[PDB]
XYZ file of N, CA and C in Angstrom:
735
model
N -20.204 -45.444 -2.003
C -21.561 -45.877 -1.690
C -22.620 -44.866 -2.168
N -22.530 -43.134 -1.870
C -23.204 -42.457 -2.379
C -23.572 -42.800 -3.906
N -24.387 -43.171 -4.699
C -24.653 -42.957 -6.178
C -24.315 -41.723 -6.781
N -24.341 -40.732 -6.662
C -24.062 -39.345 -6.988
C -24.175 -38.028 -6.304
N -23.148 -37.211 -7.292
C -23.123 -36.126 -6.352
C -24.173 -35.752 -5.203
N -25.515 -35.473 -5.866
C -26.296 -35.315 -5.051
C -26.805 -36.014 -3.766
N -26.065 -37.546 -3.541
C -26.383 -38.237 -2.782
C -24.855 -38.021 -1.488
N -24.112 -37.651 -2.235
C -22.956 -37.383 -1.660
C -22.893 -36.369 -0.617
N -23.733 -35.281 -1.061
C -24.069 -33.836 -0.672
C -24.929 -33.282 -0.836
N -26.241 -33.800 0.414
C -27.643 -33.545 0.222
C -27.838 -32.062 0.228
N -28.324 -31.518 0.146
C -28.854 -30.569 -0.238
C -28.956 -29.486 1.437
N -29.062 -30.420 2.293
C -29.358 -29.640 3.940
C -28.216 -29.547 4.207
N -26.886 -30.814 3.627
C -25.574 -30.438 4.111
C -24.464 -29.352 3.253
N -25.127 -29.058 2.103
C -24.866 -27.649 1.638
C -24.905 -26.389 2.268
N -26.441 -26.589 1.981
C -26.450 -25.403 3.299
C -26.315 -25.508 4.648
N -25.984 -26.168 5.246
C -25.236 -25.936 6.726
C -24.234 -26.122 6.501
N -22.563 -26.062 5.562
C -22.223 -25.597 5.251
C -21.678 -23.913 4.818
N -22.768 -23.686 3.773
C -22.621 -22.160 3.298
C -24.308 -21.385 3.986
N -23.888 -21.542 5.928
C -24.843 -21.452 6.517
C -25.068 -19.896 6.251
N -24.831 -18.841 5.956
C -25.084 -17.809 6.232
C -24.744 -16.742 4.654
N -24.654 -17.753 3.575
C -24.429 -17.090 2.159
C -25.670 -16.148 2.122
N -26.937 -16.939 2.665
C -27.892 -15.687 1.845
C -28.805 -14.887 2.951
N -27.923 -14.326 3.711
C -28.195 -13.699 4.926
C -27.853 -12.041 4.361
N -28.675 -11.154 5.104
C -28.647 -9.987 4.337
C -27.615 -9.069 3.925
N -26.701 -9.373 4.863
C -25.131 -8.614 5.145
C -24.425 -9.208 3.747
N -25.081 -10.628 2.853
C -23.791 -10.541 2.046
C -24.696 -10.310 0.311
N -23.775 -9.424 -0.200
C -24.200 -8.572 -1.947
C -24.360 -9.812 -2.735
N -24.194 -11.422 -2.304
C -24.556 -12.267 -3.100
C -25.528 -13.057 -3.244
N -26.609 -12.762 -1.977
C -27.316 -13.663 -1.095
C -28.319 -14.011 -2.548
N -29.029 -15.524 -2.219
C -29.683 -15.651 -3.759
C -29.207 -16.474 -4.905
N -27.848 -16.217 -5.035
C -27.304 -16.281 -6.358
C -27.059 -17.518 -6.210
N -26.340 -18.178 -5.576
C -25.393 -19.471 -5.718
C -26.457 -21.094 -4.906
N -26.895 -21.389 -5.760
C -27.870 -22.225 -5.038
C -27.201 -23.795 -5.744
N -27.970 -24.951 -4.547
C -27.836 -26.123 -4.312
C -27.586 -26.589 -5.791
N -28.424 -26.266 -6.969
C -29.051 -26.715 -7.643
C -28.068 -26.402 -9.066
N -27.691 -24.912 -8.854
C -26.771 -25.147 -9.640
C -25.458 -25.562 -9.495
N -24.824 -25.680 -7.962
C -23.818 -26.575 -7.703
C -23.816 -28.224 -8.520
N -25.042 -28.646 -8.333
C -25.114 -29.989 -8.815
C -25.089 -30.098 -10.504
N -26.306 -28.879 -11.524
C -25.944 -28.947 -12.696
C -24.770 -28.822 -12.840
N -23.514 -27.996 -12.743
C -22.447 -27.410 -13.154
C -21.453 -28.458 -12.827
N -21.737 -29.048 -11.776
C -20.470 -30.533 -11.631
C -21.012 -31.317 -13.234
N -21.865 -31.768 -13.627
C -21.852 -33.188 -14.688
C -21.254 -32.126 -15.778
N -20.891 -31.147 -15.668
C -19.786 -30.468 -17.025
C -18.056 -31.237 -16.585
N -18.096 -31.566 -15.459
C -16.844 -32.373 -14.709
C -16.948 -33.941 -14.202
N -17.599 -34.800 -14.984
C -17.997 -35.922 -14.326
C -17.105 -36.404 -13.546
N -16.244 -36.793 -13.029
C -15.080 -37.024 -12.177
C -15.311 -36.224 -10.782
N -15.192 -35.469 -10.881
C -15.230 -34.339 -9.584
C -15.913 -35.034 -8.795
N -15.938 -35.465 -7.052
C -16.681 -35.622 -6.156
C -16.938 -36.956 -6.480
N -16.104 -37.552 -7.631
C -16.490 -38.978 -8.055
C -15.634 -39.934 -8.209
N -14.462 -39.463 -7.814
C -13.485 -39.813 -7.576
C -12.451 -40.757 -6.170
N -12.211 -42.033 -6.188
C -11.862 -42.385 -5.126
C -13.315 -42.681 -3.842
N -12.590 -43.371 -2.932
C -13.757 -44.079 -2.066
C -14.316 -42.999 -1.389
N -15.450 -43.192 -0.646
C -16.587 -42.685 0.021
C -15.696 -41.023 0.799
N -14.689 -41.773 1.549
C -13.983 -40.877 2.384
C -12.991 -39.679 1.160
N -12.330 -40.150 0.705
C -11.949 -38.901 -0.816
C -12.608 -38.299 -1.487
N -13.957 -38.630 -1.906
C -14.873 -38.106 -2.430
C -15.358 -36.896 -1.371
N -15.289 -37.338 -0.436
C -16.027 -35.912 0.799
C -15.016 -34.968 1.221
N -13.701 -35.746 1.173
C -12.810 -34.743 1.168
C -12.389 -33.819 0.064
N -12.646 -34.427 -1.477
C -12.221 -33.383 -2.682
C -13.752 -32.403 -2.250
N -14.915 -32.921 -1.882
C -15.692 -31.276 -1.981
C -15.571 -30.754 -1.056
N -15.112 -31.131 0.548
C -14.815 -29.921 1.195
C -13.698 -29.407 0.592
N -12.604 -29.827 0.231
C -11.453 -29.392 -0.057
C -11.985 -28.754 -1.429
N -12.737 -28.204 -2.012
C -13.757 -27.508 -3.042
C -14.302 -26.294 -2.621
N -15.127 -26.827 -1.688
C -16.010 -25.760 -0.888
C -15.319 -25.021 0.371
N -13.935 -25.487 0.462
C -12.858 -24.704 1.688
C -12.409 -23.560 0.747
N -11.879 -23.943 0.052
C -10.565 -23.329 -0.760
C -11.827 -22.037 -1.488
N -12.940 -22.318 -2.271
C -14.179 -21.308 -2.638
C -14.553 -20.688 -2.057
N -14.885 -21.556 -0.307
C -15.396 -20.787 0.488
C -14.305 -19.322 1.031
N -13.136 -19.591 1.193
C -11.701 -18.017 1.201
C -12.201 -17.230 0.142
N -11.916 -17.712 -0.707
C -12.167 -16.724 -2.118
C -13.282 -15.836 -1.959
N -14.347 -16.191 -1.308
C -15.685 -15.438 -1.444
C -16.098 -14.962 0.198
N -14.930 -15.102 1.108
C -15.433 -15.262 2.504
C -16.053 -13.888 2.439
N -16.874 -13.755 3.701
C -17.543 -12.468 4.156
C -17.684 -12.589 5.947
N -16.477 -13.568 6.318
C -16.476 -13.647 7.584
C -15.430 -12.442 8.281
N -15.831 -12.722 9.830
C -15.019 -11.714 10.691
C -14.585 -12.364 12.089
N -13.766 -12.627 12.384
C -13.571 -13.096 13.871
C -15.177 -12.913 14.604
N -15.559 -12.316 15.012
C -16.449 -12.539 16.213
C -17.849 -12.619 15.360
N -17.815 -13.513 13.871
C -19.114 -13.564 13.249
C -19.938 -14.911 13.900
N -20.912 -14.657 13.660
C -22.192 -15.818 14.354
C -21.719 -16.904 13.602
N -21.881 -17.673 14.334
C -21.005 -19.118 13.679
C -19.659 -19.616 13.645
N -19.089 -18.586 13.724
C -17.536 -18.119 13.293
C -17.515 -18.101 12.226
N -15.650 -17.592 11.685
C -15.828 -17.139 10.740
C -15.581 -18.216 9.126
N -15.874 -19.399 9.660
C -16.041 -20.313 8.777
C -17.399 -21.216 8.375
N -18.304 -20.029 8.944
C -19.958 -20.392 8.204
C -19.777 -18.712 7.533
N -19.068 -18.553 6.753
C -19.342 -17.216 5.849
C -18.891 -17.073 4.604
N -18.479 -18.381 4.023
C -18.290 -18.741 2.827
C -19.574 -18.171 1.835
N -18.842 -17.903 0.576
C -19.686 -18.049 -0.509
C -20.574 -16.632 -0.158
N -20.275 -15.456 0.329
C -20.831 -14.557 0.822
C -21.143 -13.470 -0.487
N -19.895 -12.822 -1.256
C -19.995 -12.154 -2.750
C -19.437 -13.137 -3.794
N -19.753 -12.698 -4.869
C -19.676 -12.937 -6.504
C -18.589 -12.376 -6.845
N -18.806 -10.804 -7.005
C -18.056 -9.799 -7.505
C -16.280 -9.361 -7.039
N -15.384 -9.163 -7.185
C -14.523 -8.769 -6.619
C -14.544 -7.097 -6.036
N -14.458 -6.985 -4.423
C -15.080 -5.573 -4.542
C -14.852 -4.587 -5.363
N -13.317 -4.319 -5.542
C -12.996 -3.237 -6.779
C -12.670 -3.687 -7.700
N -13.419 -3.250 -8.926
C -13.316 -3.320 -10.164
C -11.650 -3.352 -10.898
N -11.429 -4.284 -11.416
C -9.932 -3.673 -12.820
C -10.377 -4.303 -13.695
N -9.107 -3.936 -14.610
C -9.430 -4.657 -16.038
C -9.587 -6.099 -15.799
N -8.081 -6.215 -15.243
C -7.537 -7.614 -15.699
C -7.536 -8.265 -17.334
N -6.592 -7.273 -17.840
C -6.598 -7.656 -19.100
C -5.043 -7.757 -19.900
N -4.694 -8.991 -19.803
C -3.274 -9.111 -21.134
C -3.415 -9.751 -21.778
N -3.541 -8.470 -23.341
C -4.073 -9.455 -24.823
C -3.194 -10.242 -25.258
N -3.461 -11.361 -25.680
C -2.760 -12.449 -27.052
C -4.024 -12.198 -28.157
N -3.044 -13.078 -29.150
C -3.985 -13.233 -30.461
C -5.197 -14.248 -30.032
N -4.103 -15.210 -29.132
C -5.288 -15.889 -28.834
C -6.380 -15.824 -27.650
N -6.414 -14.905 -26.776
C -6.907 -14.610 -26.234
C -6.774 -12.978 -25.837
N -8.032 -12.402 -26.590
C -8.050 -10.722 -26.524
C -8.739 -10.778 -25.433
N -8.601 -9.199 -25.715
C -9.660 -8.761 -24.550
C -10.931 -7.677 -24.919
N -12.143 -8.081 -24.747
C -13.095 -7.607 -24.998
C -13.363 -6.197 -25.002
N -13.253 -4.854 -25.652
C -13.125 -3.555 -25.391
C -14.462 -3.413 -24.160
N -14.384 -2.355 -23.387
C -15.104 -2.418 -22.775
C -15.883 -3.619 -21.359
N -14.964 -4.767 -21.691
C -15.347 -5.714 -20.687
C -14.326 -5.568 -19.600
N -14.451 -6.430 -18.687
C -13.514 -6.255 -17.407
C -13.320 -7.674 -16.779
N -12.710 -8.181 -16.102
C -12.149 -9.657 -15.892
C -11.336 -9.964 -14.520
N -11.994 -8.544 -13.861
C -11.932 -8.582 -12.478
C -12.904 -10.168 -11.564
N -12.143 -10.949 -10.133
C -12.631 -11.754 -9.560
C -14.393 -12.175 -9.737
N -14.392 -13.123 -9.991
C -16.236 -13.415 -10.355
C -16.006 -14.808 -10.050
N -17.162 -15.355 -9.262
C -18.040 -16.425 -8.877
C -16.971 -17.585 -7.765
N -16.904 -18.728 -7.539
C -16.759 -19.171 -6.170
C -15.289 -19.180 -6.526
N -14.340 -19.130 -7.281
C -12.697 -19.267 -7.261
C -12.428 -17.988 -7.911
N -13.387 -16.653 -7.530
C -12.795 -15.516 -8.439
C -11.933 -15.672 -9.244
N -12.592 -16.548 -10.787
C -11.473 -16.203 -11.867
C -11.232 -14.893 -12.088
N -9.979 -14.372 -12.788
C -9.876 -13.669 -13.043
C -8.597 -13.530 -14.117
N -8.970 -12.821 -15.240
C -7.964 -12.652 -16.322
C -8.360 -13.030 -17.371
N -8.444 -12.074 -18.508
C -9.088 -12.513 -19.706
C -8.692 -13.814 -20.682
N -7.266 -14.323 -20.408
C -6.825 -15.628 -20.499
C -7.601 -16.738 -19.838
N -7.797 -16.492 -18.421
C -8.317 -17.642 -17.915
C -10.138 -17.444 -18.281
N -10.592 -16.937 -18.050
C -12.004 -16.589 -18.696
C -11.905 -17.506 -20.096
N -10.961 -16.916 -20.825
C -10.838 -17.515 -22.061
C -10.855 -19.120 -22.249
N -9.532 -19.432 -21.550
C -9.682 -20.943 -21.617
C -11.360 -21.835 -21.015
N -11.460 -21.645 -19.716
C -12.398 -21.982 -19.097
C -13.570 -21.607 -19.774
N -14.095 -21.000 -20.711
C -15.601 -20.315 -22.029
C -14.986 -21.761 -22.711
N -13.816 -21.296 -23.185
C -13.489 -22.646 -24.363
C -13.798 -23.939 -24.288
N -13.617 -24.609 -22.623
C -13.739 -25.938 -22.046
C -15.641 -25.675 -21.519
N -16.289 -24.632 -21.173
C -17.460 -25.292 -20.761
C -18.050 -24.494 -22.152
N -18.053 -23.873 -22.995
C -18.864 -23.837 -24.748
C -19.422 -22.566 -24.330
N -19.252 -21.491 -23.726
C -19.643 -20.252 -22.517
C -18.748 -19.117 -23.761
N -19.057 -17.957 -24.373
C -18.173 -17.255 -24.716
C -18.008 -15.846 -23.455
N -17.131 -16.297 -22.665
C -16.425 -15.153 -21.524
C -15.526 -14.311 -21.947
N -15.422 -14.533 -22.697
C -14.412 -12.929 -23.346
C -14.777 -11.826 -24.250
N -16.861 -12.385 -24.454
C -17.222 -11.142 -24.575
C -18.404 -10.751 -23.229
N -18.598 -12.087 -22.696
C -19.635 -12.231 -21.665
C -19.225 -12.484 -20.101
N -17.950 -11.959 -19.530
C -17.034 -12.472 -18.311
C -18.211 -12.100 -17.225
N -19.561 -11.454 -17.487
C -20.258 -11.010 -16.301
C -21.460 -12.116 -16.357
N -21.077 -13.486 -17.033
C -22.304 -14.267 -17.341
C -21.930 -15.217 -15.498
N -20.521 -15.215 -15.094
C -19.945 -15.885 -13.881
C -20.602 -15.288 -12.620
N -21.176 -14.054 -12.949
C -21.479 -13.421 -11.269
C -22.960 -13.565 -11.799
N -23.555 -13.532 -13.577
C -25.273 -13.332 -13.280
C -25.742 -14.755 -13.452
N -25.022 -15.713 -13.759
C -25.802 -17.494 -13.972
C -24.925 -18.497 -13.124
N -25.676 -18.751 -12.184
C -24.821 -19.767 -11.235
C -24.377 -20.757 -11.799
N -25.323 -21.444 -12.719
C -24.476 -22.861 -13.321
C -23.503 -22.169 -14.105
N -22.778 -21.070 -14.420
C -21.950 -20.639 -15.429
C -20.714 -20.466 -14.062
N -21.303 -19.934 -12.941
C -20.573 -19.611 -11.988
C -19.379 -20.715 -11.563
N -20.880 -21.480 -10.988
C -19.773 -22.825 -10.672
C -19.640 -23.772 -11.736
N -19.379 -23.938 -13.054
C -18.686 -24.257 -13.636
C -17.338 -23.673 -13.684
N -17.445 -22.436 -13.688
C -16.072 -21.793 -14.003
C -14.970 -22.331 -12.727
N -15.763 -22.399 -12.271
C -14.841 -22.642 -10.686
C -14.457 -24.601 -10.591
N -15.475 -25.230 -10.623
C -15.359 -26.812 -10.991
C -14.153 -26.738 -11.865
N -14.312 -25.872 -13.218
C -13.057 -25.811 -14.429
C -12.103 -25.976 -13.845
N -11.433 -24.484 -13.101
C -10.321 -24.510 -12.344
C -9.742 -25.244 -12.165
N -10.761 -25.954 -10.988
C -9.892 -27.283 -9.902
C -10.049 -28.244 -10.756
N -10.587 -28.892 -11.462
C -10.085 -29.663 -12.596
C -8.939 -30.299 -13.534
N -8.595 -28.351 -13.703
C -7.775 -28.158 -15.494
C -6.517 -28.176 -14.650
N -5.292 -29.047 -14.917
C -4.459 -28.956 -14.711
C -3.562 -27.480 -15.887
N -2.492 -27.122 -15.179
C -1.494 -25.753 -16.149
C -0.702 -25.788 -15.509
N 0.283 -26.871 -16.405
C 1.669 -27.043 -16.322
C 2.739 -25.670 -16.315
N 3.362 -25.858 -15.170
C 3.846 -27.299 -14.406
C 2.624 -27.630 -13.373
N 1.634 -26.856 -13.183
C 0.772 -27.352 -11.716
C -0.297 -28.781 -12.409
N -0.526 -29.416 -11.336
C -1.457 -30.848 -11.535
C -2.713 -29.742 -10.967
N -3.294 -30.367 -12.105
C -4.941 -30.090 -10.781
C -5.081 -30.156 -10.119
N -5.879 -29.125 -8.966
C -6.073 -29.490 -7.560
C -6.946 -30.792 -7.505
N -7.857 -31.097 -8.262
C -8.610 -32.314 -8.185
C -7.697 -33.391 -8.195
N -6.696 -33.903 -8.476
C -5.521 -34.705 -8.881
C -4.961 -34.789 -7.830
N -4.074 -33.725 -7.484
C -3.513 -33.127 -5.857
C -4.535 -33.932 -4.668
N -5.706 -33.860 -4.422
C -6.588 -33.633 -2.986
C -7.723 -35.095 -3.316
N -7.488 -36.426 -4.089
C -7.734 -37.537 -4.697
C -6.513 -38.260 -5.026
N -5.560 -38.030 -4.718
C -4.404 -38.863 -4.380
C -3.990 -39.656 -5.898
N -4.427 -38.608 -6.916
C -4.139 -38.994 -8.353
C -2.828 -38.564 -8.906
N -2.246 -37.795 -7.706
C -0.927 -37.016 -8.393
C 0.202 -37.276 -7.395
N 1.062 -37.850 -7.906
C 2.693 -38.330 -7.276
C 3.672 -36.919 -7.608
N 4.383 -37.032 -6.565
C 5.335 -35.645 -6.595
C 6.638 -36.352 -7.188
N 7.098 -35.539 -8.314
C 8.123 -35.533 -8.402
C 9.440 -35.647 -7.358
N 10.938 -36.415 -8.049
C 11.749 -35.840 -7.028
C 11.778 -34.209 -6.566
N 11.817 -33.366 -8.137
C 11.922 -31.984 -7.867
C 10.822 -31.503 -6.915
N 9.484 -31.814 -7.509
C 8.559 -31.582 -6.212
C 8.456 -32.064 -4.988
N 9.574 -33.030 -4.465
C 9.496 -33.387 -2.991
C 10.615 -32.348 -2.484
N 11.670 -32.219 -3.355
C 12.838 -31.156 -2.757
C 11.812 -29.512 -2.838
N 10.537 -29.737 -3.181
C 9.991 -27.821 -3.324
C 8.899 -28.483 -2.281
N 9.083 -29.259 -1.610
C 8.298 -29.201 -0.636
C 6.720 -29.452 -1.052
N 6.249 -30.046 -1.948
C 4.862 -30.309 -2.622
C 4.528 -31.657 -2.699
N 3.923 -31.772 -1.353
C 3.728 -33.169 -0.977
C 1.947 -33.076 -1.700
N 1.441 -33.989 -1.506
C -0.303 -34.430 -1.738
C -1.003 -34.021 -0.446
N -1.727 -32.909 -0.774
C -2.610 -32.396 0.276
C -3.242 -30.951 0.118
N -4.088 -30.563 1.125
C -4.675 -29.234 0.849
C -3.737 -28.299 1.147
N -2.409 -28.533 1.543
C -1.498 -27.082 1.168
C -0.939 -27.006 -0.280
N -0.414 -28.281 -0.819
C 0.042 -28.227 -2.289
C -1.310 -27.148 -2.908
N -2.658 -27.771 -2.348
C -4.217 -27.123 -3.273
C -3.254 -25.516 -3.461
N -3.809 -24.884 -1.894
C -3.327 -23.921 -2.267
C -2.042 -23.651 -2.919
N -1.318 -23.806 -2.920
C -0.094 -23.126 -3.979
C -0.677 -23.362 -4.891
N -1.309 -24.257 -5.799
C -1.320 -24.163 -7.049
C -2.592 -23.198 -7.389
N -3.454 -22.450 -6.228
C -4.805 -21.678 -6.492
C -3.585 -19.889 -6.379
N -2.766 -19.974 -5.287
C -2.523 -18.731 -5.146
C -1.006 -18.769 -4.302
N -0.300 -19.313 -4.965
C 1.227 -19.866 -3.912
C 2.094 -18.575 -3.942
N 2.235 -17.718 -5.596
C 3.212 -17.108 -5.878
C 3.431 -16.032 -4.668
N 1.789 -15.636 -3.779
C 1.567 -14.663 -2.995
C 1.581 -15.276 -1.732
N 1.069 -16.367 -1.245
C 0.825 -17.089 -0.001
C 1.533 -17.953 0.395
N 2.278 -18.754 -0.297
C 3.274 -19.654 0.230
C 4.431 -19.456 0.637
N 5.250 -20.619 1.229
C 6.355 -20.348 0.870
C 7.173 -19.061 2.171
N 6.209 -18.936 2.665
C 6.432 -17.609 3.769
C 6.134 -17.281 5.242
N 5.949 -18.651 5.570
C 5.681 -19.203 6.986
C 3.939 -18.950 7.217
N 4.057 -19.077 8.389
C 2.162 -19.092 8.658
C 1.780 -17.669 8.095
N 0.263 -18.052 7.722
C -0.382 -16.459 6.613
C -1.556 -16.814 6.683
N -2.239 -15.839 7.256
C -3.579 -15.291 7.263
C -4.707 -15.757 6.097
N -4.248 -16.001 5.393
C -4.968 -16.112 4.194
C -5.196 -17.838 3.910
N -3.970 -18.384 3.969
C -3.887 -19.663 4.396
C -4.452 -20.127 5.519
N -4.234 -19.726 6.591
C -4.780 -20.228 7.660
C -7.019 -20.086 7.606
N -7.304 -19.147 6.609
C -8.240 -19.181 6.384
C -8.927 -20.325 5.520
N -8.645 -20.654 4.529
C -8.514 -21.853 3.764
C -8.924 -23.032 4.659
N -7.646 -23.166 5.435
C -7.610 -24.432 6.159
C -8.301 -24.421 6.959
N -9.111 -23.648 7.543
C -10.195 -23.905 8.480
C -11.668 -23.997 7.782
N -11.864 -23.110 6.309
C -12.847 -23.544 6.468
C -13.004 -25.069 5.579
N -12.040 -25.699 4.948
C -11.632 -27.178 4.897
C -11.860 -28.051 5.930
N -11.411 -27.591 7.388
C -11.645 -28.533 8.393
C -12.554 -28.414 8.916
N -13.682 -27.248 8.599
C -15.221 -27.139 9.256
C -15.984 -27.954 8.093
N -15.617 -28.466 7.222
C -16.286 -28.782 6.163
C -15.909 -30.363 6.366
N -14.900 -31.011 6.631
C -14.313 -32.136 6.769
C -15.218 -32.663 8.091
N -15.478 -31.337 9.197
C -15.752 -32.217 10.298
C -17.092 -32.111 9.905
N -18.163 -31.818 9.641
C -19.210 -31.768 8.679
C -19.278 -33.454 8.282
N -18.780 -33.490 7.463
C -18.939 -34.825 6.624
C -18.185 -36.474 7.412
N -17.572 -35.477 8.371
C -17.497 -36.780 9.440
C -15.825 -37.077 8.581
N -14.788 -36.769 7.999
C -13.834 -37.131 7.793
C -12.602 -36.161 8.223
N -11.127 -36.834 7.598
C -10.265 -36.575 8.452
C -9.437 -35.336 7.814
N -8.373 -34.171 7.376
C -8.239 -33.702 7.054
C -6.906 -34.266 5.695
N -6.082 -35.567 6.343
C -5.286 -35.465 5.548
C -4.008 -35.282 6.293
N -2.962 -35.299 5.901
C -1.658 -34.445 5.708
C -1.438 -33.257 5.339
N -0.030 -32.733 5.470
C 0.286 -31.642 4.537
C -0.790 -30.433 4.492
N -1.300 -30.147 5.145
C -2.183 -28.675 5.185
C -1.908 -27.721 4.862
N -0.701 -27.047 5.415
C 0.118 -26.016 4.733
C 1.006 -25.685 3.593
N 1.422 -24.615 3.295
C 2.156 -24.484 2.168
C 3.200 -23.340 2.677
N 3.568 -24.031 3.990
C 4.287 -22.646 4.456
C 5.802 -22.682 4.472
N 6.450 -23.546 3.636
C 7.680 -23.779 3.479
C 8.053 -24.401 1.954
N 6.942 -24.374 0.964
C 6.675 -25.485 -0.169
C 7.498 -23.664 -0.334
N 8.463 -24.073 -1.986
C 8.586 -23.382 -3.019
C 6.961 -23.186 -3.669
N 6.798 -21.638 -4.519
C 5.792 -21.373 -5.069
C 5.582 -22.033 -5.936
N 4.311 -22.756 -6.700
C 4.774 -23.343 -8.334
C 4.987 -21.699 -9.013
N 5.808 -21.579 -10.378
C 5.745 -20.417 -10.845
C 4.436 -20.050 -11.681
């Protein structure tokens, strides 16, 4: 029923949402606005456009959950709790390279490819691909993700998008576009926001009973779900799924 993104996700339910991004406590406050959330999706026309009224609200919380971990700046006893503290930094606090050259994807002397913008890419490969798919050159410019929001959240839209086999896109996964294999029903990778995560960060988080990190995810998914008035789904966890490799 929404006509588009923007009708999907007005602009007041953003920010009550990412209620406390530009509050003084967080090094990103400023940066990540309504506006370029909305340019940087039509580089993904599909996204948020996908499936009826109720899937559509669930792929962007299940967007803005999984972004909102990556960038949290929450704390147990934060105002709001700690799932209005999404989207808090850009930067990954400490600096590395993050750099393994191919021919086809070098690495910029002097650049660095440490975590940047709402799915902290990171790795001069993935920089690479993701410049290639939005026309962005990040492998000499990887700091264009923390200084231009529409570059930001594109990079991050990319992500959940680009499927990299063997993983399906999380967009695919959390829109009910992707059927599990037999092998993937015996690894435990059913359709839902726990498959999401494994395929964002499984090799470290899954697979290993309840985890902190996960359990972060999934809440701020279900503060975002109850937000938009929908249901969470199935399958939440990934606490028994094999990792994808």
């Amino acid at each position: 029923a929404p006509s588009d993104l923007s009708a999907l996700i007005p602009r007041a339910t953003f920010d009550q949402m990412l209620k406390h991004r530009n509050d003084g406590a967080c090094p990103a406050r400023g940066f990540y606005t309504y506006d370029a959330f909305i340019a940087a999706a039509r580089a993904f026309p599909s996204f948020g456009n996908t499936g009826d009224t109720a899937t559509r609200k669930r792929e962007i919380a299940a967007f803005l959950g999984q972004t909102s971990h990556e960038t949290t700046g929450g704390w147990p006893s934060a105002p709001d709790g700690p799932y209005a503290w999404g989207y808090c930094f850009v930067r990954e606090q400490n600096p590395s390279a993050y750099c393994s050259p191919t021919p086809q994807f070098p690495c910029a002397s002097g650049q660095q490819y440490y975590g940047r913008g709402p799915i902290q890419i990171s790795w001069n490969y993935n920089y690479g691909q993701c410049g290639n798919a939005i026309g962005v050159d990040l492998i000499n410019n990887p700091d264009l993700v923390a200084t231009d929001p529409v570059v930001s959240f594109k990079s991050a839209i990319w992500f959940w998008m680009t499927p990299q086999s063997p993983k399906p896109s999380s967009h695919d996964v959390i829109t009910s576009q992707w059927t599990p294999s037999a092998a993937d029903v015996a690894a435990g990778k059913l359709p839902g926001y726990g498959t999401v995560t494994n395929i964002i960060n499984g090799g470290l988080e899954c697979g290993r009973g309840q985890d902190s990190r996960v359990e972060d995810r999934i809440g701020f998914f279900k503060q975002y779900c109850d937000l938009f008035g929908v249901g969470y789904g199935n399958n939440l966890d990934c606490y028994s799924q094999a990792p994808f490799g």
